[PDB]
Coordinates of C-alpha atoms and ligand atoms in Angstrom, one line a residue:
Chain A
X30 CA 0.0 0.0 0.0
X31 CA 1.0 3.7 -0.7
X32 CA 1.8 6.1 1.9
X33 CA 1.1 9.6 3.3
X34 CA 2.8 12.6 4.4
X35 CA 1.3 15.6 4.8
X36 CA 3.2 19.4 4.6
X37 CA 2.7 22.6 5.4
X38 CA 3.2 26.1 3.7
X39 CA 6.5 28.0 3.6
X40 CA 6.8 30.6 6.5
X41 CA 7.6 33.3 4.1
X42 CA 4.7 32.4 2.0
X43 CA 1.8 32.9 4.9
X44 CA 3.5 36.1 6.0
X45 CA 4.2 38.0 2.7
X46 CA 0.8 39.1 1.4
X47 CA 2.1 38.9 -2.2
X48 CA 2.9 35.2 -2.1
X49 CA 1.0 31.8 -2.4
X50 CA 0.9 29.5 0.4
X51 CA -0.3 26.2 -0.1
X52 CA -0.4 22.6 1.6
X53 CA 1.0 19.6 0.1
X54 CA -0.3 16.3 -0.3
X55 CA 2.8 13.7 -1.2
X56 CA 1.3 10.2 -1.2
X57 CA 4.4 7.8 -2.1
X58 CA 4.7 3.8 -2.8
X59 CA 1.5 4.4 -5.7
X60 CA 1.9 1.1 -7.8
X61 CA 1.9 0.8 -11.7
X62 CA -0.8 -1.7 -11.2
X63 CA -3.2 1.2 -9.7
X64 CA -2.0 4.5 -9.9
X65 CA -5.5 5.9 -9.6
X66 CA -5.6 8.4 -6.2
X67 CA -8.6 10.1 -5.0
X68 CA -8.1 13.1 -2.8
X69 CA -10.3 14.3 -0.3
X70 CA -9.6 17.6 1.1
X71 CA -11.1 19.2 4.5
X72 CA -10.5 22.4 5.8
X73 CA -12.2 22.1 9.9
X74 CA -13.9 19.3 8.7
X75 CA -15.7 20.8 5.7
X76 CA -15.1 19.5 2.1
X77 CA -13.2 21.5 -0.3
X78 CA -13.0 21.1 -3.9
X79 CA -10.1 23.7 -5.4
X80 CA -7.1 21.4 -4.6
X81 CA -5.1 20.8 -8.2
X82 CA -3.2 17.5 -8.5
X83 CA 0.8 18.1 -9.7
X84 CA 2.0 15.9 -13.1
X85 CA 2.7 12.5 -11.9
X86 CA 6.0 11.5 -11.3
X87 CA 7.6 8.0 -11.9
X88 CA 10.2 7.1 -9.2
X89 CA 13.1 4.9 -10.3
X90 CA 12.2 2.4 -7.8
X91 CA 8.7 1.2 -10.3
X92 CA 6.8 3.4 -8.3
X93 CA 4.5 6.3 -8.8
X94 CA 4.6 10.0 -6.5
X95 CA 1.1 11.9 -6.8
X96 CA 0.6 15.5 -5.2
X97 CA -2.1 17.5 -4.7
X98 CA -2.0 21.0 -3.5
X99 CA -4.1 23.2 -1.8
X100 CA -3.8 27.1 -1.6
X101 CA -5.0 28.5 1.5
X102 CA -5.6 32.0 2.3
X103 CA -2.9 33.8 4.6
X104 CA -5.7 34.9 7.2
X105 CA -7.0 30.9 7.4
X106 CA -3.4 29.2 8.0
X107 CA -2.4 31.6 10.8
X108 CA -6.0 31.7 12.5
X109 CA -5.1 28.0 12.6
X110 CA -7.4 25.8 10.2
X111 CA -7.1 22.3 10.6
X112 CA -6.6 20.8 7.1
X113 CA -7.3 17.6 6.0
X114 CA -6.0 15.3 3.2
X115 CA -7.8 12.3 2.8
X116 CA -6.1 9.4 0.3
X117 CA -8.3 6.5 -1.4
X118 CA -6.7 3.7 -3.0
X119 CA -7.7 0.5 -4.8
X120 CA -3.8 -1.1 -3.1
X121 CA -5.4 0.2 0.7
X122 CA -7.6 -1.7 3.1
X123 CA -9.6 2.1 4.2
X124 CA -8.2 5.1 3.1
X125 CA -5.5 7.4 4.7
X126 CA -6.0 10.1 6.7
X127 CA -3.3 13.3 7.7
X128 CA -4.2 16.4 9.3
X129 CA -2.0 19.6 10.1
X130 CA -2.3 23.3 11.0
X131 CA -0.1 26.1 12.3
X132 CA 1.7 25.4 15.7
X133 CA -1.3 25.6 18.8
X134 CA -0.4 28.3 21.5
X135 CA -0.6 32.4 21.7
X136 CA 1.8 34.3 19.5
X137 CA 4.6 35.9 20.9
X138 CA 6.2 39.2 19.7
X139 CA 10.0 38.8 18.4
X140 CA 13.0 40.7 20.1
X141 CA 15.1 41.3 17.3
X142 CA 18.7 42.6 19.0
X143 CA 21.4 43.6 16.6
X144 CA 24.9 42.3 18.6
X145 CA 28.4 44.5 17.3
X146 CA 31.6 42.4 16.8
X147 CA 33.8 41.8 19.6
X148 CA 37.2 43.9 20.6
X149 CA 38.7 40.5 20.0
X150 CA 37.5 39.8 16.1
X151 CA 38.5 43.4 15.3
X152 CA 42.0 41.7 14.7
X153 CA 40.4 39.6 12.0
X154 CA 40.1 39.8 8.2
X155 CA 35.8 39.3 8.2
X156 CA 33.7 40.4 11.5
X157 CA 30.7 39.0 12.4
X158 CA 27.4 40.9 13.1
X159 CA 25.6 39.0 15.4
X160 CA 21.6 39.9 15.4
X161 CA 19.6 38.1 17.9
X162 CA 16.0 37.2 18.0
X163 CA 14.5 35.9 21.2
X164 CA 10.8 34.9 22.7
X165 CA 8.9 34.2 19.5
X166 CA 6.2 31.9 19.3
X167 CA 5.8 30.3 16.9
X168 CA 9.1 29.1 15.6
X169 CA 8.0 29.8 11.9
X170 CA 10.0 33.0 11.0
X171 CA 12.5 34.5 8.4
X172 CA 15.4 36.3 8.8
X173 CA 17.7 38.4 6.1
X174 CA 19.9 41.1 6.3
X175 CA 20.4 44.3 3.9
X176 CA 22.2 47.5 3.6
X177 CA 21.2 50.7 1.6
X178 CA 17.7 48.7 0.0
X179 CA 20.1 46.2 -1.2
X180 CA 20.1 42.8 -0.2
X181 CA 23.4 41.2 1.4
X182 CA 23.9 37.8 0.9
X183 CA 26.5 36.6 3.0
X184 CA 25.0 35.4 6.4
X185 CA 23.9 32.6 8.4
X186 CA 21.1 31.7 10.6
X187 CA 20.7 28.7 13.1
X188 CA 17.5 26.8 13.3
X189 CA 15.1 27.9 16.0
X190 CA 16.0 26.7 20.2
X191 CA 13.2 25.9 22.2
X192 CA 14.0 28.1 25.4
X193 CA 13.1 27.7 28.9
X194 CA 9.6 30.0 28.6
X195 CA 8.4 28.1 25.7
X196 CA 9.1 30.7 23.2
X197 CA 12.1 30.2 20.5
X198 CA 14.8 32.0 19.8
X199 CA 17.7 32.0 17.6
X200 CA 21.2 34.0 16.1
X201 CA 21.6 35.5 12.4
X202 CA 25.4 35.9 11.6
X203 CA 26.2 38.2 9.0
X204 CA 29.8 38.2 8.1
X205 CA 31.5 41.3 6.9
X206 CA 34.6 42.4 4.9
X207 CA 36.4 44.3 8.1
X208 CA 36.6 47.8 5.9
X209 CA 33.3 48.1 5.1
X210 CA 32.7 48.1 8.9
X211 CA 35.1 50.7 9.5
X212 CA 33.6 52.5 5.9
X214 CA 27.9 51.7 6.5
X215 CA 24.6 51.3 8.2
X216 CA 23.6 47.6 8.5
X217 CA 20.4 46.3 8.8
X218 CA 18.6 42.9 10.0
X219 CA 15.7 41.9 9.5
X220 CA 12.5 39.7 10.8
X221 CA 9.4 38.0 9.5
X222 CA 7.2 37.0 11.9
X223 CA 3.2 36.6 12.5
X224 CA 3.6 38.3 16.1
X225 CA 5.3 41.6 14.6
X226 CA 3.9 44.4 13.4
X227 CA 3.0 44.3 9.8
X228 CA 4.6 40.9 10.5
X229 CA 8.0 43.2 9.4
X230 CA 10.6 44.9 11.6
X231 CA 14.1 45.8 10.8
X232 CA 17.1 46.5 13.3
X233 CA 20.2 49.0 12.3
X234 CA 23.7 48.6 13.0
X235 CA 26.8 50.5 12.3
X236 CA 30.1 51.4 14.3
Chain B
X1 CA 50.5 23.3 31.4
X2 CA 47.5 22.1 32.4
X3 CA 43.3 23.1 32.0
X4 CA 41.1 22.7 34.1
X5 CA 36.7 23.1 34.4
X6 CA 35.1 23.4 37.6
X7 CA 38.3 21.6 39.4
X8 CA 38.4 18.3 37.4
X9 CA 41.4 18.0 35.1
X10 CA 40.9 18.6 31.1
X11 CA 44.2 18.2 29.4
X12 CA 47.7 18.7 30.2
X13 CA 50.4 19.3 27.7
Chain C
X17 CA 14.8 -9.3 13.0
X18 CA 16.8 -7.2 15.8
X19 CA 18.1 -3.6 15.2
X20 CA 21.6 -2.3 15.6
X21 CA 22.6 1.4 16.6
X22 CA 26.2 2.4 17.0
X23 CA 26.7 5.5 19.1
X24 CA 29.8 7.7 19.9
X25 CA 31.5 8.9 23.0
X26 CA 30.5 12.2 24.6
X27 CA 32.5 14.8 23.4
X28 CA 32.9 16.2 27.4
X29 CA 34.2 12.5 27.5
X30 CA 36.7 12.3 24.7
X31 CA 37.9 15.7 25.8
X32 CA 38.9 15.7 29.4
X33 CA 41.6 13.2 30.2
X34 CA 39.7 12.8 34.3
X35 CA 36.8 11.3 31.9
X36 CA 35.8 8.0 30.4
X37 CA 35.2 7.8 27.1
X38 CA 33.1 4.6 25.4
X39 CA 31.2 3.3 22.0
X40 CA 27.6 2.0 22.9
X41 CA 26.3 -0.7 20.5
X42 CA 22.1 -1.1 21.3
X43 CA 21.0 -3.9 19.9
X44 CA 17.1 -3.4 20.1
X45 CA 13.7 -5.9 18.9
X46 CA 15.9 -9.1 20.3
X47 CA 13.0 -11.3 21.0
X48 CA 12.3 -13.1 23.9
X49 CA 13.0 -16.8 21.9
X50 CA 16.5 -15.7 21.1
X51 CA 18.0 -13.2 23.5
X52 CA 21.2 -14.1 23.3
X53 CA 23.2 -11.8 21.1
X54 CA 27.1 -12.8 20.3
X55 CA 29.1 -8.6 20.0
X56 CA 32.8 -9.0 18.5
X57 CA 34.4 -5.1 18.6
X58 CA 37.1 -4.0 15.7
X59 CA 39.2 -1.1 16.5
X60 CA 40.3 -0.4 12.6
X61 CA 39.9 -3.6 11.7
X62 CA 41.2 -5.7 14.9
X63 CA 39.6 -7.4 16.9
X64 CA 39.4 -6.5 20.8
X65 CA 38.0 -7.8 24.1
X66 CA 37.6 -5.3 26.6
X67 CA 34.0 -5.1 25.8
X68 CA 31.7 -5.4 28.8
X69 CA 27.9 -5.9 28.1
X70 CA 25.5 -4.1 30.3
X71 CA 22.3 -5.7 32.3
X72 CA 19.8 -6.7 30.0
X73 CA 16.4 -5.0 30.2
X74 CA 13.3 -5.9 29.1
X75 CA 11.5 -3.7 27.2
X76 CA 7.6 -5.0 28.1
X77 CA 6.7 -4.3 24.1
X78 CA 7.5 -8.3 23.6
X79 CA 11.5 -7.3 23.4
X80 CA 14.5 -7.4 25.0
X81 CA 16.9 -4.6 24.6
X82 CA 21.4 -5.5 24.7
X83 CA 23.6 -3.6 24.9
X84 CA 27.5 -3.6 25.1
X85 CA 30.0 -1.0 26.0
X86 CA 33.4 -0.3 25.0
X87 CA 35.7 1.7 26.7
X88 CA 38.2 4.3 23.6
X89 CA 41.1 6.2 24.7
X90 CA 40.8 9.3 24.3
X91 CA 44.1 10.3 22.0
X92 CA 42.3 7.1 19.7
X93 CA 39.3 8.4 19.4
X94 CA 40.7 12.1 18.6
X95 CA 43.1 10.4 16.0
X96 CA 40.1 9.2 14.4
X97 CA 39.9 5.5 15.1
X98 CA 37.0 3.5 13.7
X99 CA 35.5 1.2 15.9
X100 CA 33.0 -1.8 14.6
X101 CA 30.5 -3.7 16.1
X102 CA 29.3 -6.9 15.2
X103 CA 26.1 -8.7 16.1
X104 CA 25.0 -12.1 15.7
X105 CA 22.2 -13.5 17.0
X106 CA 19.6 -16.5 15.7
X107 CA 16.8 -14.6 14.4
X108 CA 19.4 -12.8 12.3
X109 CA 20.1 -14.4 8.9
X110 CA 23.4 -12.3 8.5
X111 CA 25.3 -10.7 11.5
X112 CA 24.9 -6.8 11.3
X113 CA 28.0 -4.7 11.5
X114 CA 28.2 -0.6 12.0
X115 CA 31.3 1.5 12.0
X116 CA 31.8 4.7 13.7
X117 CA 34.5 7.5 14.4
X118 CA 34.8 11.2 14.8
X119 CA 34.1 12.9 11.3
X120 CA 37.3 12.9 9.4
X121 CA 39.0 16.1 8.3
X122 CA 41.9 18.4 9.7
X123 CA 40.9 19.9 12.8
X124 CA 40.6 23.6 13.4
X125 CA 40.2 25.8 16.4
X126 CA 37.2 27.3 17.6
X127 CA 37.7 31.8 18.1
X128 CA 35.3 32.1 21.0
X129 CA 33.8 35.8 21.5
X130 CA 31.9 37.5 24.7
X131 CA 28.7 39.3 23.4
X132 CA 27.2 41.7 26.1
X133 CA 23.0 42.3 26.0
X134 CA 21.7 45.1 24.1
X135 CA 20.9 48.2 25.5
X136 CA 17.7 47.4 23.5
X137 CA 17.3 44.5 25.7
X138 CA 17.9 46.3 29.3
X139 CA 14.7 47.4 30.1
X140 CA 13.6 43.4 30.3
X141 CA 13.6 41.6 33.7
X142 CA 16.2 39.1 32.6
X143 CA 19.2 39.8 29.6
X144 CA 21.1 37.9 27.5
X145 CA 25.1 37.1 27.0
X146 CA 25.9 35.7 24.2
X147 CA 28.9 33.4 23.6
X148 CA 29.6 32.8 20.0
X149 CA 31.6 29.8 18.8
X150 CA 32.9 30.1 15.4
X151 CA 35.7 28.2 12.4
X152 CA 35.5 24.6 14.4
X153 CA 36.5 21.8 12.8
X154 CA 35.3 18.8 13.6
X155 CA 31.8 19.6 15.1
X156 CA 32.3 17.8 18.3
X157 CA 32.4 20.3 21.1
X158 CA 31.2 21.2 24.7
X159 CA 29.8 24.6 25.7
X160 CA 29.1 25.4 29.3
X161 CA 28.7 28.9 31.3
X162 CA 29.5 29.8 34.8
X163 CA 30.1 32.2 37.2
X164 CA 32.3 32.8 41.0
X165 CA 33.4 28.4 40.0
X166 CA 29.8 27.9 40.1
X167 CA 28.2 26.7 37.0
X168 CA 25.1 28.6 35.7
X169 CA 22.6 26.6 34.7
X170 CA 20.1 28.6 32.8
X171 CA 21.3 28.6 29.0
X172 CA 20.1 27.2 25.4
X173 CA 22.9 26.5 23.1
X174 CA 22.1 26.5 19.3
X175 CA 23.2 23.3 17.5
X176 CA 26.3 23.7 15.2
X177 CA 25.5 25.0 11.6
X178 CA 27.9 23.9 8.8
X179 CA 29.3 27.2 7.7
X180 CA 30.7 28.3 4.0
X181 CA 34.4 27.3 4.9
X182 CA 33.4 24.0 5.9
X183 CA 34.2 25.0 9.2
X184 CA 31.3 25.2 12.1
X185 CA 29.6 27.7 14.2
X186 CA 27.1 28.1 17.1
X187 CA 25.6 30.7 19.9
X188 CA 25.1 29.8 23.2
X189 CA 22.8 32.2 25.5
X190 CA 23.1 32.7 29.0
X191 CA 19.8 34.2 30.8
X192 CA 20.6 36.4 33.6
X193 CA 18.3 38.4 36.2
X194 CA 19.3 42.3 35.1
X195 CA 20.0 42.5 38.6
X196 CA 23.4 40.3 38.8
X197 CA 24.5 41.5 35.5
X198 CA 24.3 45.2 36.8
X199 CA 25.7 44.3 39.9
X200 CA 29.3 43.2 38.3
X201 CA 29.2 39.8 38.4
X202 CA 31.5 38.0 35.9
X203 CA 30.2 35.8 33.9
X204 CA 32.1 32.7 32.2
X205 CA 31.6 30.6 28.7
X206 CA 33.8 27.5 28.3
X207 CA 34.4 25.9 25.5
X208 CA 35.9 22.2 25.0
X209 CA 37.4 21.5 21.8
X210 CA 40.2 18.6 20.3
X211 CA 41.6 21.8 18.7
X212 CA 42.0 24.3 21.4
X213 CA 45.2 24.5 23.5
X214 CA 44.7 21.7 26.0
X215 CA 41.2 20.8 24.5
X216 CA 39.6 24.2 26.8
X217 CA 39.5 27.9 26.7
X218 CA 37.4 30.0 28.6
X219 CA 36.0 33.7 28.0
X220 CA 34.6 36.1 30.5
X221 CA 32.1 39.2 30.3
X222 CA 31.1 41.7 32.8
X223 CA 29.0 45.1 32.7
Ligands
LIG301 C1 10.7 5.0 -3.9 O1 11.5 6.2 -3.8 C2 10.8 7.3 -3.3 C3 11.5 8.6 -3.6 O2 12.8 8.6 -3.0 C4 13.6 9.6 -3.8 O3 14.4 8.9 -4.8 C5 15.3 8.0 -4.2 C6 16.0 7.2 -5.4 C7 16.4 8.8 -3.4 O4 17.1 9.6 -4.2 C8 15.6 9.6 -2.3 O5 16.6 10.4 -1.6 C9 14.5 10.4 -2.8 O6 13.7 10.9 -1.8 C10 10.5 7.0 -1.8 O7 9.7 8.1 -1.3 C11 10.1 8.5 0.0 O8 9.4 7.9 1.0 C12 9.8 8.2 2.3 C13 9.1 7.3 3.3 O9 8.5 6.2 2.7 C14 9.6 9.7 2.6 O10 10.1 10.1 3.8 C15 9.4 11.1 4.5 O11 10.1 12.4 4.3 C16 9.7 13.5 5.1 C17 10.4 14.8 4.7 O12 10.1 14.9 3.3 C18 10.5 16.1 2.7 O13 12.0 16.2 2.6 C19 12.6 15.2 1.9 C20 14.1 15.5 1.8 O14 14.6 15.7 3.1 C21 12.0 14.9 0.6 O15 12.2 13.5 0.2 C22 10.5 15.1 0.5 O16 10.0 15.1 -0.8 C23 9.9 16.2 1.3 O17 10.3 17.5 0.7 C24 9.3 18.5 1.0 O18 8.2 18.5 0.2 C25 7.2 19.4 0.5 C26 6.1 19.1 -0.6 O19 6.5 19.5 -1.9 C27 7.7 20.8 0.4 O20 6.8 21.8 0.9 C28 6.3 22.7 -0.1 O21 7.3 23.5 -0.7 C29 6.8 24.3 -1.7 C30 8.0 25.0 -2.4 O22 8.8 24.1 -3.0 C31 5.7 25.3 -1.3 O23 6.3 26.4 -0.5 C32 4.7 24.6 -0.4 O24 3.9 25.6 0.3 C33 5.2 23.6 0.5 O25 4.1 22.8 1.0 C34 9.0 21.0 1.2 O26 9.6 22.2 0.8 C35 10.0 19.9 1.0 N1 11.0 19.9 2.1 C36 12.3 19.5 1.9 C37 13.2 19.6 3.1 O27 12.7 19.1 0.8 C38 9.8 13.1 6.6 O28 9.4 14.2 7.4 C39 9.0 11.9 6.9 O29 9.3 11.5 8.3 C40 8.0 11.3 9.0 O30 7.7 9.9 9.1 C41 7.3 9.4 10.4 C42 5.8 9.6 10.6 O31 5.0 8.7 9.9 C43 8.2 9.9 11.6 O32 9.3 9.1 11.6 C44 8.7 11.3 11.4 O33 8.4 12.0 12.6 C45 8.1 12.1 10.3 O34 6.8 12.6 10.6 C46 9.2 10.7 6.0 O35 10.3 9.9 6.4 C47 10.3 10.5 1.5 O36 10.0 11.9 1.5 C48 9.9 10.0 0.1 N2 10.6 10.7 -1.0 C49 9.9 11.5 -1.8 C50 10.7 12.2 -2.9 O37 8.7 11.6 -1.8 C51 9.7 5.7 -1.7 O38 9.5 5.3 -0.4 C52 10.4 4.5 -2.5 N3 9.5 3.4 -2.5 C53 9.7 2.3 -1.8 C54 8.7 1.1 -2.0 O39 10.5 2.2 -0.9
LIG302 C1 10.3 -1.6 22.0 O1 10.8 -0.5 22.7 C2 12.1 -0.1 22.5 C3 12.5 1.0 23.5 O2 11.7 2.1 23.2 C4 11.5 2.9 24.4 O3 10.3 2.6 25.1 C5 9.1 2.7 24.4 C6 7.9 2.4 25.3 C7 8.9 4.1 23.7 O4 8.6 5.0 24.7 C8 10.2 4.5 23.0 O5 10.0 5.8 22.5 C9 11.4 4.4 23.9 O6 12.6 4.7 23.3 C10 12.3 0.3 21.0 O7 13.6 0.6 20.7 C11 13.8 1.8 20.0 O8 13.9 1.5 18.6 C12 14.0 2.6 17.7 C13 13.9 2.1 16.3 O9 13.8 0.7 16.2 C14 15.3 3.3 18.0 O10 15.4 4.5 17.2 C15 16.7 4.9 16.9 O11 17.1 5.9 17.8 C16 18.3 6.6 17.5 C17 18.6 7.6 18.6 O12 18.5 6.8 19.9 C18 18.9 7.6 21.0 O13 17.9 8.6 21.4 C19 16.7 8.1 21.9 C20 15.9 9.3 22.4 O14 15.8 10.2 21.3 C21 16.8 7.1 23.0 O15 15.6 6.5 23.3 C22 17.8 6.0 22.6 O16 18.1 5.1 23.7 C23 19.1 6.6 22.2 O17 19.7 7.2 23.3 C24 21.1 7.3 23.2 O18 21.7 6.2 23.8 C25 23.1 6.1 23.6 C26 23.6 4.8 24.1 O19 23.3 4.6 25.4 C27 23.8 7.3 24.3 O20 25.1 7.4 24.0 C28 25.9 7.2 25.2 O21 25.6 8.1 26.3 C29 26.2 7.7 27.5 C30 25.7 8.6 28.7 O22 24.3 8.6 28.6 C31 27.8 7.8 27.4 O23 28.2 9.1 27.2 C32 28.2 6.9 26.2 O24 29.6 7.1 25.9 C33 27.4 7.3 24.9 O25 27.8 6.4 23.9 C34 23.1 8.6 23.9 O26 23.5 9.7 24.7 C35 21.6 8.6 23.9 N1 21.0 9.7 23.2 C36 20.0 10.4 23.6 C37 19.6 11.6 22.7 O27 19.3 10.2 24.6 C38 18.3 7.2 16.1 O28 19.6 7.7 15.8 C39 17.9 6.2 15.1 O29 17.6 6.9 13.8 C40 18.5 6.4 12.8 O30 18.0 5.2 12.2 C41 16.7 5.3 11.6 C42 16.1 3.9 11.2 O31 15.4 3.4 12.2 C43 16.7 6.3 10.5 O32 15.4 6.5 9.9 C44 17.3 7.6 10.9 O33 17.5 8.5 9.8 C45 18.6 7.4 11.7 O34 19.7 7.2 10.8 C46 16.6 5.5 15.5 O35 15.5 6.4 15.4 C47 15.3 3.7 19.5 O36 16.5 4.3 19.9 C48 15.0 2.5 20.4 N2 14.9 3.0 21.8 C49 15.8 2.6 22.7 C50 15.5 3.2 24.1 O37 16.8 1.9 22.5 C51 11.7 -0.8 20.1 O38 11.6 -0.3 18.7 C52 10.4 -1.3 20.5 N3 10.1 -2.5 19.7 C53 9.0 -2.6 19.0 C54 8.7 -3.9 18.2 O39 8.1 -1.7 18.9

C-alpha cells in the first residue's frame, strides 16, 4: 500500500501578502498496477473542492509519486485551520488520513537585538554581526539582512532553540569584509506573525 | 600546562 | 529481526583526560526466543576484548533490549579510530556490522567571542550574554557557562550549523536576572574543543 505525508506552507509564503501559500499532499509507494488516487480535502472538517493534482512523477524504484496542493488564504493558516488530506486507494484496506495546522499556543512578539563584533575579532580579516532574536512563538519565521535597499547575501542563521519559557529563539550571523565596517549602516531583518505588519528591521553600524 | 573546568582535570600538555 | 545502533563517546568525555570515554552498540527488537546476542568489537579492523555488556532489560513491548559497552582512549578516538561492532544473534540471517568514528577532516580551532545584552534589551527583567563559537572543525564540542566556580545553569545552546568554509559555528545564550548582571558579576563561557590549546578555553564578560 501507498503512503502519506502531509506538509505545510513556507513561512515566508503565509507572512508576505504577495505570495502563495499552499499545503502539500505527497502520497508515495503508488503502484503501476493502480495508480488511480482520490483526494479528499477538508479544511475544519468541511469539504473543499479547489485542490489541483501536480503531473505525476515515476520514481526509479517502479513506483508512482502523486501530489495535490491546496492554496489556503494567509488569514486561514495563521488563524489556525485544521486541514485535512484524505487518500483513497484501490492497493489500501480504508483510506488514509493526515491532518495539520499552524503550531497551537498564543503568539509571541519577536526581540530582534542587533549584537556588534567583539574587541577580539576586530584583529580579523571578516567580522561577524551577530543579530539576535529571542521569545517568539511560533518558531515559523525569516530572517535576512540588507544594507542601503540592497540585499546582502553573506550570512547565516541557526535553526530555531526551544528556550526555557516556551518561546524560540535563535542567532543570524552576518559576516563582513572588516573595511566596510570601519567605511555603513547595517540592517537585520525579521518576518514574523507576532510583529507588526509581521516586518521589523534592526540597524547597526560602528 | 595544564586546563582545568570546575576543578576536574581537562588536558595537560 | 533485531536492530543495531552504534553510538559515539560524549564529546565532554573524549575531551577531558579525568573522563571516560566509550562506544555504545544497542541492539534493540531481540525477541524473547533468542535473546542471546554474540558482540565481537574491531578497532580499525582488529579485533578486541575489553568489551563489557551491560544488564539486560526488558522492554515490556515483547523485546529485550542489549547492549554492550566499549571503553576508547581518548588520544584514539581524537586520532580518528573506527571502531566496529558486530552482532549475531539467531533470528538474524546475516550478523549486522556498523562502523563509527569522529568525522574525518583536519581539525581547526574554535575563536570564541563574549557578546554583552543590548541596551535594547535592558529594560527586560532578565538579559542575554551571548557566547559565539565560530571556524571549528570537527563539530564535536562542549559549551558550558558559569560564574564565581559555580556553573550557571540557565542557557540554550544552538546546534552547530555547517558554515561556508566547511568549518562550524554556534551561539550559546546565558539568561541572567538584570540585577546580577548590573551588579558586576562576571560571567564565564567555556568551551571544550580537540583543537584548542589543551582541549579548553574560557572567556569572560562583565558590565
Ligand atoms: C521509492 O523512492 C521514493 C522517492 O525517493 C527519492 O528517490 C530516491 C531514489 C532517493 O534519491 C531519495 O533520496 C528520494 O527521496 C520513496 O519516497 C520517499 O518515501 C519516504 C518514506 O517512505 C519519505 O520520507 C518522509 O520524508 C519526510 C520529509 O520529506 C521532505 O523532505 C525530503 C528531503 O529531506 C523529501 O524527500 C520530501 O520530498 C519532502 O520534501 C518537502 O516536500 C514538500 C512538498 O513538496 C515541500 O513543501 C512545499 O514547498 C513548496 C516550495 O517548493 C511550497 O512552498 C509549499 O507551500 C510547501 O508545501 C518542502 O519544501 C520539502 N522539504 C524539503 C526539506 O525538501 C519526513 O518528514 C517523513 O518522516 C516522517 O515519518 C514518520 C511519521 O510517519 C516519523 O518518523 C517522522 O516524525 C516524520 O513525521 C518521511 O520519512 C520521502 O519523503 C519520500 N521521498 C519522496 C521524494 O517523496 C519511496 O518510499 C520509495 N519506494 C519504496 C517502495 O521504498
Ligand atoms: C520496544 O521499545 C524499544 C524501546 O523504546 C522505548 O520505550 C518505548 C515504550 C517508547 O517510549 C520509545 O520511545 C522508547 O525509546 C524500541 O527501541 C527503539 O527502537 C528505535 C527504532 O527501532 C530506536 O530508534 C533509533 O534511535 C536513535 C537515537 O536513539 C537515542 O535517542 C533516543 C531518544 O531520542 C533514546 O531512546 C535511545 O536510547 C538513544 O539514546 C542514546 O543512547 C546512547 C547509548 O546509550 C547514548 O550514548 C551514550 O551516552 C552515555 C551517557 O548517557 C555515554 O556518554 C556513552 O559514551 C554514549 O555512547 C546517547 O547519549 C543517547 N542519546 C539520547 C539523545 O538520549 C536514532 O539515531 C535512530 O535513527 C536512525 O535510524 C533510523 C532507522 O530506524 C533512520 O530513519 C534515521 O535517519 C537514523 O539514521 C533511530 O531512530 C530507538 O533508539 C530505540 N529505543 C531505545 C531506548 O533503545 C523498540 O523499537 C520497541 N520494539 C517494538 C517492536 O516496537
Amino acid at each position: 500500500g501507498p503512503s502519506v505525508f502531509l506538509f505545510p506552507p513556507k513561512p515566508k509564503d503565509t507572512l508576505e501578502a504577495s505570495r502563495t501559500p499552499e499545503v502539500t499532499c505527497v502520497v508515495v509507494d503508488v503502484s503501476h498496477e493502480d495508480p488511480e488516487v482520490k483526494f479528499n480535502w477538508y479544511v475544519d472538517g468541511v469539504e473543499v473542492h479547489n485542490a489541483k493534482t501536480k503531473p505525476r512523477e515515476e520514481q526509479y524504484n517502479s513506483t508512482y509519486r502523486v501530489v495535490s496542493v491546496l492554496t489556503v488564504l494567509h488569514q486561514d493558516w495563521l488563524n489556525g485551520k485544521e486541514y485535512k488530506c484524505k487518500v483513497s486507494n484501490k492497493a489500501l484496506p480504508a483510506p488514509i488520513e493526515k491532518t495539520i495546522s499552524k503550531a497551537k499556543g498564543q503568539p509571541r512578539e519577536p526581540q530582534v537585538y542587533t549584537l556588534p563584533p567583539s574587541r577580539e575579532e576586530m584583529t580579523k580579516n571578516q567580522v561577524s554581526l551577530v543579530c539576535l532574536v529571542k521569545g517568539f512563538y511560533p518558531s515559523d519565521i525569516a530572517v535576512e539582512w540588507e544594507s542601503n535597499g540592497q540585499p546582502e547575501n553573506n550570512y547565516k542563521t541557526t535553526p530555531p532553540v526551544l528556550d526555557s519559557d516556551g518561546s524560540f529563539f535563535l542567532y543570524s550571523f552576518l559576516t563582513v569584509d572588516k573595511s566596510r565596517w570601519q567605511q555603513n549602516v547595517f540592517s537585520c531583518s525579521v518576518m514574523h506573525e507576532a510583529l507588526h505588519n509581521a516586518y521589523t528591521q534592526k540597524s547597526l553600524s560602528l | 600546562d595544564c586546563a582545568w573546568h570546575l576543578g576536574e582535570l581537562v588536558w595537560c600538555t
